[PDB]
Protein backbone atom coordinates (compact mmCIF):
# COMPACT_ATOMS: atom_id res chain seq x y z
CA UNK A 1 0.00 0.00 0.00
CA UNK A 2 1.02 3.66 -0.61
CA UNK A 3 -1.38 5.24 1.95
CA UNK A 4 1.53 7.34 3.46
CA UNK A 5 1.26 9.63 0.39
CA UNK A 6 -1.18 12.53 0.89
CA UNK A 7 -1.76 14.43 -2.41
CA UNK A 8 -3.82 17.46 -1.19
CA UNK A 9 -2.18 18.45 2.14
CA UNK A 10 -0.06 21.45 3.18
CA UNK A 11 2.96 21.45 5.56
CA UNK A 12 0.72 22.79 8.40
CA UNK A 13 -1.93 20.03 7.89
CA UNK A 14 1.03 17.53 7.74
CA UNK A 15 2.41 18.85 11.04
CA UNK A 16 -1.09 18.66 12.71
CA UNK A 17 -1.80 15.17 11.18
CA UNK A 18 1.45 13.83 12.69
CA UNK A 19 1.15 15.69 16.04
CA UNK A 20 -2.48 14.77 16.81
CA UNK A 21 -2.76 11.33 15.09
CA UNK A 22 0.84 10.07 14.96
CA UNK A 23 3.57 8.93 17.36
CA UNK A 24 7.41 9.12 17.31
CA UNK A 25 8.35 7.28 14.10
CA UNK A 26 5.15 8.32 12.25
CA UNK A 27 5.67 9.66 8.70
CA UNK A 28 4.04 10.76 5.44
CA UNK A 29 5.10 12.10 2.02
CA UNK A 30 3.35 14.87 0.08
CA UNK A 31 3.79 17.09 -3.03
CA UNK A 32 5.08 20.71 -2.59
CA UNK A 33 8.03 24.88 -5.35
CA UNK A 34 5.71 22.44 -7.32
CA UNK A 35 7.48 19.36 -8.80
CA UNK A 36 9.18 18.80 -5.39
CA UNK A 37 8.09 16.49 -2.51
CA UNK A 38 8.34 16.45 1.30
CA UNK A 39 8.91 13.61 3.74
CA UNK A 40 7.35 14.83 7.10
CA UNK A 41 8.56 12.70 10.10
CA UNK A 42 7.64 12.78 13.81
CA UNK A 43 10.74 12.37 16.05
CA UNK A 44 10.91 13.14 19.82
CA UNK A 45 7.50 14.97 19.82
CA UNK A 46 8.55 17.31 16.96
CA UNK A 47 7.92 17.19 13.14
CA UNK A 48 10.94 17.22 10.73
CA UNK A 49 10.33 18.14 7.04
CA UNK A 50 12.77 16.60 4.46
CA UNK A 51 13.00 17.83 0.85
CA UNK A 52 12.72 15.42 -2.10
CA UNK A 53 13.66 16.88 -5.43
CA UNK A 54 13.08 15.38 -8.87
CA UNK A 55 13.98 17.37 -12.03
CA UNK A 56 13.52 14.25 -14.22
CA UNK A 57 16.28 11.71 -13.40
CA UNK A 58 15.56 10.39 -9.84
CA UNK A 59 13.99 11.22 -6.47
CA UNK A 60 16.81 12.98 -4.55
CA UNK A 61 16.25 13.00 -0.76
CA UNK A 62 18.13 15.65 1.32
CA UNK A 63 20.59 13.96 3.70
CA UNK A 64 19.68 10.65 2.06
CA UNK A 65 19.99 8.83 -1.24
CA UNK A 66 18.68 8.87 -4.86
CA UNK A 67 15.73 6.56 -5.69
CA UNK A 68 13.67 5.44 -8.67
CA UNK A 69 10.22 5.80 -6.97
CA UNK A 70 8.79 7.15 -3.66
CA UNK A 71 7.62 3.56 -2.79
CA UNK A 72 11.24 2.24 -3.25
CA UNK A 73 12.54 5.13 -1.08
CA UNK A 74 9.96 4.34 1.73
CA UNK A 75 10.45 0.54 1.40
CA UNK A 76 14.26 1.00 1.76
CA UNK A 77 14.23 3.34 4.82
CA UNK A 78 11.62 1.32 6.75
CA UNK A 79 13.85 -1.78 6.20
CA UNK A 80 17.37 -0.19 6.60
CA UNK A 81 17.62 1.87 9.79
CA UNK A 82 20.47 4.36 10.41
CA UNK A 83 20.57 5.57 6.77
CA UNK A 84 18.44 8.74 7.15
CA UNK A 85 19.87 11.68 9.16
CA UNK A 86 23.65 14.17 12.24
CA UNK A 87 20.98 12.39 14.36
CA UNK A 88 19.13 9.42 12.72
CA UNK A 89 15.50 9.82 11.49
CA UNK A 90 13.45 6.56 11.62
CA UNK A 91 10.42 5.81 9.36
CA UNK A 92 8.35 3.48 11.54
CA UNK A 93 4.62 4.11 11.12
CA UNK A 94 3.03 5.21 7.83
CA UNK A 95 0.38 7.82 8.62
CA UNK A 96 -2.44 6.77 6.30
CA UNK A 97 -4.30 9.08 3.98
CA UNK A 98 -8.09 8.66 3.63
CA UNK A 99 -8.38 10.97 0.53
CA UNK A 100 -9.57 8.98 -2.57
CA UNK A 101 -8.47 11.54 -5.28
CA UNK A 102 -5.52 9.35 -6.48
CA UNK A 103 -7.69 6.17 -6.70
CA UNK A 104 -8.38 4.69 -10.18
CA UNK A 105 -12.11 4.21 -9.44
CA UNK A 106 -12.79 7.65 -7.79
CA UNK A 107 -14.54 10.06 -10.15
CA UNK A 108 -15.57 12.94 -7.80
CA UNK A 109 -18.42 14.88 -9.43
CA UNK A 110 -19.95 12.60 -12.13
CA UNK A 111 -23.87 5.04 -16.53
CA UNK A 112 -23.04 6.24 -20.12
CA UNK A 113 -19.33 5.37 -19.47
CA UNK A 114 -20.13 2.04 -17.75
CA UNK A 115 -22.40 1.03 -20.70
CA UNK A 116 -19.89 2.18 -23.39
CA UNK A 117 -16.49 1.25 -21.83
CA UNK A 118 -17.41 -1.14 -19.01
CA UNK A 119 -17.50 -4.95 -18.82
CA UNK A 120 -18.46 -7.49 -16.05
CA UNK A 121 -17.14 -6.19 -12.72
CA UNK A 122 -16.27 -2.65 -13.91
CA UNK A 123 -16.93 -0.12 -11.18
CA UNK A 124 -16.54 3.50 -10.09
CA UNK A 125 -17.29 5.75 -7.09
CA UNK A 126 -18.80 9.23 -7.59
CA UNK A 127 -20.06 11.90 -5.21
CA UNK A 128 -23.90 12.10 -4.74
CA UNK A 129 -25.12 15.71 -0.51
CA UNK A 130 -21.82 14.56 1.06
CA UNK A 131 -22.76 10.93 0.31
CA UNK A 132 -21.27 8.79 -2.51
CA UNK A 133 -22.50 6.20 -5.11
CA UNK A 134 -20.83 2.89 -6.10
CA UNK A 135 -21.80 2.06 -9.71
CA UNK A 136 -21.09 -1.54 -10.90
CA UNK A 137 -21.57 -3.28 -14.23
CA UNK A 138 -22.36 -7.04 -14.16
CA UNK A 139 -22.92 -9.63 -16.92
CA UNK A 140 -25.68 -7.12 -18.54
CA UNK A 141 -26.75 -4.28 -16.16
CA UNK A 142 -25.57 -1.32 -14.02
CA UNK A 143 -26.31 -1.33 -10.23
CA UNK A 144 -25.92 1.79 -8.05
CA UNK A 145 -25.13 1.23 -4.30
CA UNK A 146 -25.44 4.31 -2.09
CA UNK A 147 -22.52 5.16 0.20
CA UNK A 148 -23.56 7.02 3.33
CA UNK A 149 -21.08 9.31 4.97
CA UNK A 150 -22.06 9.74 8.63
CA UNK A 151 -19.53 11.20 11.17
CA UNK A 152 -16.49 10.78 8.79
CA UNK A 153 -17.28 7.07 8.33
CA UNK A 154 -18.64 5.36 5.22
CA UNK A 155 -21.20 2.51 4.95
CA UNK A 156 -23.50 0.78 2.38
CA UNK A 157 -26.60 0.98 4.67
CA UNK A 158 -25.56 -1.59 7.28
CA UNK A 159 -22.68 -3.68 8.63
CA UNK A 160 -19.21 -2.16 9.02
CA UNK A 161 -18.45 1.62 9.12
CA UNK A 162 -15.21 2.39 7.15
CA UNK A 163 -12.74 5.26 7.90
CA UNK A 164 -12.20 5.87 4.13
CA UNK A 165 -13.77 5.06 0.75
CA UNK A 166 -10.61 2.93 0.02
CA UNK A 167 -11.30 0.69 3.09
CA UNK A 168 -14.97 0.33 1.94
CA UNK A 169 -13.94 -0.48 -1.66
CA UNK A 170 -11.21 -3.01 -0.58
CA UNK A 171 -13.65 -4.72 1.82
CA UNK A 172 -16.46 -5.13 -0.77
CA UNK A 173 -13.82 -6.24 -3.36
CA UNK A 174 -12.75 -9.15 -1.03
CA UNK A 175 -16.34 -9.75 0.29
CA UNK A 176 -18.80 -8.88 -2.57
CA UNK A 177 -22.33 -7.66 -1.90
CA UNK A 178 -24.92 -10.26 -3.01
CA UNK A 179 -28.36 -9.10 -4.19
CA UNK A 180 -31.43 -11.06 -2.83
CA UNK A 181 -31.92 -12.88 -6.18
CA UNK A 182 -28.23 -13.88 -6.37
CA UNK A 183 -26.37 -11.17 -8.31
CA UNK A 184 -22.80 -10.96 -6.97
CA UNK A 185 -21.70 -7.28 -7.15
CA UNK A 186 -18.07 -8.15 -8.04
CA UNK A 187 -15.75 -5.15 -8.18
CA UNK A 188 -13.25 -6.73 -10.67
CA UNK A 189 -11.63 -3.68 -12.23
CA UNK A 190 -12.05 0.15 -12.12
CA UNK A 191 -13.81 1.56 -15.23
CA UNK A 192 -11.22 2.57 -17.87
CA UNK A 193 -11.40 6.33 -18.50
CA UNK A 194 -7.79 6.85 -19.75
CA UNK A 195 -7.90 4.80 -23.01
CA UNK A 196 -8.57 7.23 -25.86
CA UNK A 197 -8.87 6.87 -29.57
CA UNK A 198 -5.60 8.41 -31.05
CA UNK A 199 -7.51 10.83 -33.32
CA UNK A 200 -9.15 12.38 -30.15
CA UNK A 201 -5.79 13.23 -28.36
CA UNK A 202 -6.11 17.05 -28.84
CA UNK A 203 -9.55 16.80 -27.09
CA UNK A 204 -8.10 14.73 -24.16
CA UNK A 205 -5.05 17.10 -23.83
CA UNK A 206 -7.49 20.10 -23.70
CA UNK A 207 -9.56 18.41 -20.90
CA UNK A 208 -6.37 17.30 -19.03
CA UNK A 209 -5.10 20.94 -19.24
CA UNK A 210 -8.22 22.20 -17.30
CA UNK A 211 -7.94 22.72 -13.47
CA UNK A 212 -4.59 20.39 -13.61
CA UNK A 213 -6.09 17.10 -14.89
CA UNK A 214 -2.59 15.94 -15.93
CA UNK A 215 -1.45 16.09 -12.24
CA UNK A 216 -4.46 14.00 -11.05
CA UNK A 217 -3.92 11.37 -13.79
CA UNK A 218 -0.14 11.21 -13.08
CA UNK A 219 -0.60 11.00 -9.28
CA UNK A 220 -3.15 8.14 -9.75
CA UNK A 221 -0.49 6.33 -11.83
CA UNK A 222 2.06 7.06 -9.07
CA UNK A 223 -0.28 5.46 -6.54
CA UNK A 224 0.06 2.16 -8.46
CA UNK A 225 3.88 2.01 -8.08
CA UNK A 226 3.48 0.03 -4.76
CA UNK A 227 2.59 -3.07 -6.98
CA UNK A 228 6.02 -2.83 -8.65
CA UNK A 229 8.42 -3.52 -5.73
CA UNK A 230 10.03 -6.57 -7.47
CA UNK A 231 13.26 -8.10 -6.17
CA UNK A 232 16.51 -6.33 -7.12
CA UNK A 233 18.81 -8.82 -5.32
CA UNK A 234 21.49 -9.26 -8.05
CA UNK A 235 22.22 -5.52 -8.07
CA UNK A 236 22.83 -5.62 -4.28
CA UNK A 237 25.61 -8.27 -4.52
CA UNK A 238 28.95 -6.98 -3.12
CA UNK A 239 30.67 -7.64 -6.43
CA UNK A 240 27.94 -5.62 -8.30
CA UNK A 241 27.81 -2.54 -5.96
CA UNK A 242 30.31 -0.40 -7.94
CA UNK A 243 28.56 -1.34 -11.25
CA UNK A 244 25.63 0.91 -10.22
CA UNK A 245 25.82 4.67 -10.93
CA UNK A 246 23.34 5.28 -8.06
CA UNK A 247 23.64 2.62 -5.29
CA UNK A 248 19.86 2.49 -4.61
CA UNK A 249 18.65 2.54 -8.31
CA UNK A 250 18.76 -1.13 -9.34
CA UNK A 251 17.54 -3.34 -12.21
CA UNK A 252 14.66 -5.79 -11.50
CA UNK A 253 16.06 -9.35 -11.42
CA UNK A 254 13.24 -10.72 -13.61
CA UNK A 255 14.06 -8.39 -16.58
CA UNK A 256 17.76 -7.55 -16.02
CA UNK A 257 20.14 -8.17 -18.93
CA UNK A 258 22.27 -11.27 -18.06
CA UNK A 259 25.75 -11.26 -19.62
CA UNK A 260 27.01 -14.69 -20.67
CA UNK A 261 30.31 -13.45 -22.29
CA UNK A 262 31.88 -14.57 -18.95
CA UNK A 263 35.60 -14.18 -18.21
CA UNK A 264 36.34 -17.29 -16.00
CA UNK A 265 33.67 -14.62 -10.75
CA UNK A 266 30.66 -12.26 -11.18
CA UNK A 267 30.80 -11.35 -14.83
CA UNK A 268 26.99 -11.50 -15.60
CA UNK A 269 25.84 -8.06 -14.31
CA UNK A 270 24.93 -4.76 -15.92
CA UNK A 271 22.48 -2.12 -14.57
CA UNK A 272 20.12 -2.57 -17.58
CA UNK A 273 16.67 -4.11 -18.24
CA UNK A 274 15.02 -5.54 -21.34
CA UNK A 275 11.87 -3.49 -22.09
CA UNK A 276 9.18 -5.33 -24.17
CA UNK A 277 6.23 -3.32 -25.62
CA UNK A 278 13.80 -8.18 -30.10
CA UNK A 279 13.73 -5.81 -33.12
CA UNK A 280 10.63 -4.13 -31.46
CA UNK A 281 12.28 -4.22 -27.98
CA UNK A 282 14.59 -1.93 -25.93
CA UNK A 283 17.27 -2.20 -23.33
CA UNK A 284 16.89 0.67 -20.81
CA UNK A 285 20.24 1.32 -19.06
CA UNK A 286 22.29 3.85 -17.12
CA UNK A 287 25.12 6.05 -18.45
CA UNK A 288 28.39 4.02 -18.40
CA UNK A 289 30.85 4.28 -15.52
CA UNK A 290 34.60 3.91 -16.34
CA UNK A 291 34.42 0.37 -14.87
CA UNK A 292 31.24 -0.66 -16.88
CA UNK A 293 32.25 0.41 -20.45
CA UNK A 294 33.51 -3.15 -21.24
CA UNK A 295 30.23 -4.66 -19.82
CA UNK A 296 28.23 -2.15 -21.89
CA UNK A 297 29.94 -3.36 -25.14
CA UNK A 298 29.52 -7.01 -24.09
CA UNK A 299 25.75 -6.26 -23.70
CA UNK A 300 25.50 -4.51 -27.12
CA UNK A 301 27.33 -7.42 -28.82
CA UNK A 302 25.41 -10.26 -27.05
CA UNK A 303 21.93 -8.71 -27.67
CA UNK A 304 22.76 -7.92 -31.31
CA UNK A 305 21.70 -4.22 -30.77
CA UNK A 306 22.42 -2.05 -33.83
CA UNK A 307 21.14 1.29 -32.48
CA UNK A 308 21.97 3.19 -29.30
CA UNK A 309 20.07 6.24 -28.11
CA UNK A 310 21.92 8.52 -25.74
CA UNK A 311 19.70 11.20 -24.14
CA UNK A 312 22.24 13.04 -22.00
CA UNK A 313 25.47 15.02 -22.56
CA UNK A 314 28.54 13.41 -21.06
CA UNK A 315 28.59 16.25 -18.51
CA UNK A 316 25.67 18.27 -17.18
CA UNK A 317 25.95 20.92 -14.38
CA UNK A 318 29.64 20.02 -14.00
CA UNK A 319 28.64 16.41 -13.12
CA UNK A 320 29.63 13.29 -15.13
CA UNK A 321 26.36 11.67 -16.44
CA UNK A 322 27.98 9.07 -18.78
CA UNK A 323 31.57 8.33 -19.61
CA UNK A 324 32.60 8.60 -23.30
CA UNK A 325 32.31 4.85 -24.14
CA UNK A 326 32.96 5.36 -27.87
CA UNK A 327 36.24 6.25 -29.73
CA UNK A 328 36.97 9.68 -31.27
CA UNK A 329 35.96 9.95 -34.97
CA UNK A 330 38.23 7.72 -37.20
CA UNK A 331 39.78 6.14 -34.08
CA UNK A 332 39.81 2.43 -33.17
CA UNK A 333 39.69 1.20 -29.53
CA UNK A 334 39.54 -2.10 -27.63
CA UNK A 335 37.25 -2.24 -24.54
CA UNK A 336 38.14 -5.61 -23.08
CA UNK A 337 37.41 -8.34 -25.71
CA UNK A 338 35.34 -5.91 -27.85
CA UNK A 339 36.78 -3.64 -30.53
CA UNK A 340 35.03 -0.46 -31.67
CA UNK A 341 35.83 1.81 -34.64
CA UNK A 342 34.12 5.18 -34.99
CA UNK A 343 33.73 5.34 -38.79
CA UNK A 344 32.04 8.75 -39.11
CA UNK A 345 30.18 11.37 -36.99
CA UNK A 346 27.34 13.45 -38.55
CA UNK A 347 26.09 16.52 -36.65
CA UNK A 348 22.37 17.55 -36.87
CA UNK A 349 20.69 20.48 -34.98
CA UNK A 350 19.51 18.46 -31.88
CA UNK A 351 21.75 15.39 -32.12
CA UNK A 352 24.96 13.75 -33.36
CA UNK A 353 25.00 10.41 -35.19
CA UNK A 354 28.13 8.26 -34.76
CA UNK A 355 28.61 5.27 -37.10
CA UNK A 356 30.38 2.64 -35.03
CA UNK A 357 31.85 -0.77 -36.04
CA UNK A 358 31.71 -3.32 -33.20
CA UNK A 359 33.42 -6.70 -33.38
CA UNK A 360 34.92 -9.22 -30.97
CA UNK A 361 38.78 -9.27 -30.80
CA UNK A 362 40.21 -12.28 -32.74
CA UNK A 363 36.98 -12.78 -34.75
CA UNK A 364 36.64 -10.66 -37.90
CA UNK A 365 33.35 -12.22 -39.13
CA UNK A 366 31.58 -10.80 -35.98
CA UNK A 367 31.63 -7.18 -37.18
CA UNK A 368 28.34 -5.18 -37.31
CA UNK A 369 27.56 -1.49 -37.57
CA UNK A 370 26.14 0.17 -34.41
CA UNK A 371 24.48 3.56 -34.97
CA UNK A 372 24.75 5.90 -32.05
CA UNK A 373 22.13 8.64 -31.83
CA UNK A 374 23.29 11.17 -29.32
CA UNK A 375 20.54 13.68 -28.41
CA UNK A 376 22.43 16.74 -27.16
CA UNK A 377 19.81 19.50 -26.57
CA UNK A 378 17.54 18.13 -23.80
CA UNK A 379 17.52 20.83 -20.97
CA UNK A 380 19.48 20.19 -17.70
CA UNK A 381 16.12 20.19 -15.76
CA UNK A 382 12.56 19.67 -16.98
CA UNK A 383 11.60 18.86 -20.55
CA UNK A 384 11.80 20.57 -23.99
CA UNK A 385 9.11 23.26 -24.54
CA UNK A 386 8.35 21.74 -28.07
CA UNK A 387 8.44 17.96 -28.91
CA UNK A 388 9.27 18.38 -32.65
CA UNK A 389 13.00 17.87 -31.99
CA UNK A 390 12.46 14.63 -29.97
CA UNK A 391 9.93 13.35 -32.58
CA UNK A 392 12.21 14.07 -35.58
CA UNK A 393 15.07 12.20 -33.73
CA UNK A 394 12.81 9.23 -32.77
CA UNK A 395 11.52 9.06 -36.36
CA UNK A 396 15.18 8.75 -37.60
CA UNK A 397 16.04 6.13 -34.91
CA UNK A 398 12.94 4.13 -35.84
CA UNK A 399 13.84 4.10 -39.59
CA UNK A 400 17.47 3.14 -38.94
CA UNK A 401 16.29 0.23 -36.72
CA UNK A 402 13.57 -0.83 -39.25
CA UNK A 403 16.21 -0.91 -42.08
CA UNK A 404 18.48 -3.47 -40.31
CA UNK A 405 17.47 -7.15 -40.73
CA UNK A 406 17.28 -9.05 -37.39
CA UNK A 407 18.53 -6.07 -35.28
CA UNK A 408 18.38 -6.73 -31.52
CA UNK A 409 16.78 -4.29 -29.01
CA UNK A 410 17.37 -0.52 -29.29
CA UNK A 411 19.67 0.49 -26.37
CA UNK A 412 18.45 3.67 -24.60
CA UNK A 413 20.35 5.47 -21.83
CA UNK A 414 20.58 8.76 -19.96
CA UNK A 415 22.22 9.11 -16.43
CA UNK A 416 20.15 6.70 -14.18
CA UNK A 417 18.37 5.24 -17.22
CA UNK A 418 14.85 5.78 -15.94
CA UNK A 419 13.57 9.33 -16.53
CA UNK A 420 14.56 10.59 -19.97
CA UNK A 421 15.16 6.89 -20.92
CA UNK A 422 11.59 5.98 -19.86
CA UNK A 423 10.18 9.10 -21.61
CA UNK A 424 11.85 8.40 -25.01
CA UNK A 425 10.86 4.64 -24.76
CA UNK A 426 7.15 5.37 -23.91
CA UNK A 427 6.86 8.02 -26.73
CA UNK A 428 8.40 5.45 -29.10
CA UNK A 429 6.00 2.67 -27.99
CA UNK A 430 2.87 4.91 -28.41
CA UNK A 431 4.00 6.30 -31.73
CA UNK A 432 4.70 2.74 -32.96
CA UNK A 433 0.96 1.82 -32.46
CA UNK A 434 -0.05 4.90 -34.56
CA UNK A 435 2.43 3.60 -37.25
CA UNK A 436 1.03 0.04 -37.29
CA UNK A 437 -2.75 0.38 -36.46
CA UNK A 438 -3.12 3.94 -37.93
CA UNK A 439 -4.74 7.12 -36.43
CA UNK A 440 -7.94 5.06 -35.66
CA UNK A 441 -6.30 3.10 -32.84
CA UNK A 442 -6.67 3.12 -29.05
CA UNK A 443 -3.89 4.55 -26.86
CA UNK A 444 -3.76 4.39 -23.04
CA UNK A 445 -0.75 6.51 -21.79
CA UNK A 446 -0.76 5.39 -18.05
CA UNK A 447 -1.38 1.75 -19.11
CA UNK A 448 1.70 1.83 -21.38
CA UNK A 449 3.77 3.50 -18.63
CA UNK A 450 2.65 1.00 -15.91
CA UNK A 451 3.64 -1.84 -18.29
CA UNK A 452 7.17 -0.28 -18.83
CA UNK A 453 7.61 0.38 -15.05
CA UNK A 454 7.01 -3.33 -14.25
CA UNK A 455 10.21 -3.95 -16.39
CA UNK A 456 12.48 -1.22 -14.89
CA UNK A 457 11.91 0.91 -11.76
CA UNK A 458 10.51 4.43 -12.12
CA UNK A 459 10.41 4.54 -15.94
CA UNK A 460 9.05 8.16 -16.57
CA UNK A 461 9.99 10.19 -13.47
CA UNK A 462 7.97 13.37 -13.46
CA UNK A 463 4.63 15.01 -14.26
CA UNK A 464 6.51 17.30 -16.71
CA UNK A 465 7.66 14.16 -18.66
CA UNK A 466 4.08 12.69 -18.43
CA UNK A 467 2.62 15.84 -20.04
CA UNK A 468 5.54 15.82 -22.58
CA UNK A 469 4.51 12.27 -23.68
CA UNK A 470 0.91 13.54 -24.31
CA UNK A 471 2.32 16.58 -26.22
CA UNK A 472 4.66 14.36 -28.28
CA UNK A 473 1.87 11.94 -29.26
CA UNK A 474 -0.44 14.98 -30.04
CA UNK A 475 2.25 16.54 -32.32
CA UNK A 476 2.86 13.22 -34.12
CA UNK A 477 -0.90 12.87 -34.96
CA UNK A 478 -1.20 16.59 -36.02
CA UNK A 479 1.70 16.15 -38.55
CA UNK A 480 0.15 12.96 -40.05
Ligand SMILES: COc1cccc(-c2nnc3n(Cc4ccc(C(=O)N5CCC[C@H]5C(=O)O)cc4Cl)c(=O)c4ccccc4n23)c1O
Pocket residue numbers: 075076077079080229230231232233236247248249250
Ligand atom coordinates in the same frame (compact mmCIF):
# COMPACT_ATOMS: atom_id res chain seq x y z
C1 LIG B 1 8.89 -9.38 -3.75
O1 LIG B 1 9.80 -8.27 -3.63
C2 LIG B 1 11.08 -8.50 -3.19
C3 LIG B 1 11.62 -9.78 -2.80
C4 LIG B 1 12.98 -9.91 -2.40
C5 LIG B 1 13.80 -8.75 -2.33
C6 LIG B 1 13.27 -7.48 -2.69
C7 LIG B 1 14.08 -6.26 -2.62
N1 LIG B 1 14.85 -5.91 -3.66
N2 LIG B 1 15.47 -4.73 -3.31
C8 LIG B 1 14.92 -4.38 -2.15
N3 LIG B 1 15.20 -3.17 -1.44
C9 LIG B 1 16.13 -2.20 -2.04
C10 LIG B 1 17.57 -2.24 -1.53
C11 LIG B 1 18.03 -3.24 -0.63
C12 LIG B 1 19.37 -3.23 -0.17
C13 LIG B 1 20.27 -2.21 -0.58
C14 LIG B 1 21.73 -2.26 -0.16
O2 LIG B 1 22.55 -1.74 -0.92
N4 LIG B 1 22.17 -2.94 0.94
C15 LIG B 1 22.99 -4.16 0.89
C16 LIG B 1 24.01 -3.96 2.01
C17 LIG B 1 23.25 -3.16 3.07
C18 LIG B 1 21.97 -2.64 2.38
C19 LIG B 1 21.71 -1.17 2.78
O3 LIG B 1 21.99 -0.17 1.92
O4 LIG B 1 21.27 -0.89 3.89
C20 LIG B 1 19.79 -1.22 -1.49
C21 LIG B 1 18.45 -1.22 -1.96
CL1 LIG B 1 17.93 0.00 -3.06
C22 LIG B 1 14.65 -2.90 -0.23
O5 LIG B 1 14.90 -1.88 0.42
C23 LIG B 1 13.68 -3.93 0.32
C24 LIG B 1 13.06 -3.70 1.58
C25 LIG B 1 12.14 -4.63 2.12
C26 LIG B 1 11.85 -5.80 1.39
C27 LIG B 1 12.48 -6.06 0.16
C28 LIG B 1 13.38 -5.12 -0.42
N5 LIG B 1 14.04 -5.27 -1.69
C29 LIG B 1 11.92 -7.36 -3.11
O6 LIG B 1 11.43 -6.13 -3.48
Ligand SMILES: CC1(N)CCN(c2cnc(-c3cccc(Cl)c3Cl)c(N)n2)CC1
Pocket residue numbers: 100101102103104105106107108193194216217218220221222224444446447450
Ligand atom coordinates in the same frame (compact mmCIF):
# COMPACT_ATOMS: atom_id res chain seq x y z
C1 LIG C 1 -10.38 10.98 -11.82
C2 LIG C 1 -9.30 9.93 -11.39
N1 LIG C 1 -9.22 10.02 -9.91
C3 LIG C 1 -7.89 10.35 -11.97
C4 LIG C 1 -7.46 9.75 -13.34
N2 LIG C 1 -7.91 8.35 -13.44
C5 LIG C 1 -7.04 7.35 -13.75
C6 LIG C 1 -7.49 6.05 -14.04
N3 LIG C 1 -6.61 5.08 -14.40
C7 LIG C 1 -5.28 5.33 -14.50
C8 LIG C 1 -4.44 4.18 -14.92
C9 LIG C 1 -4.65 3.59 -16.18
C10 LIG C 1 -3.91 2.45 -16.57
C11 LIG C 1 -2.95 1.91 -15.70
C12 LIG C 1 -2.75 2.52 -14.46
CL1 LIG C 1 -1.59 1.85 -13.35
C13 LIG C 1 -3.50 3.63 -14.05
CL2 LIG C 1 -3.28 4.28 -12.44
C14 LIG C 1 -4.81 6.64 -14.26
N4 LIG C 1 -3.50 6.98 -14.31
N5 LIG C 1 -5.70 7.60 -13.90
C15 LIG C 1 -9.35 8.08 -13.26
C16 LIG C 1 -9.79 8.51 -11.84
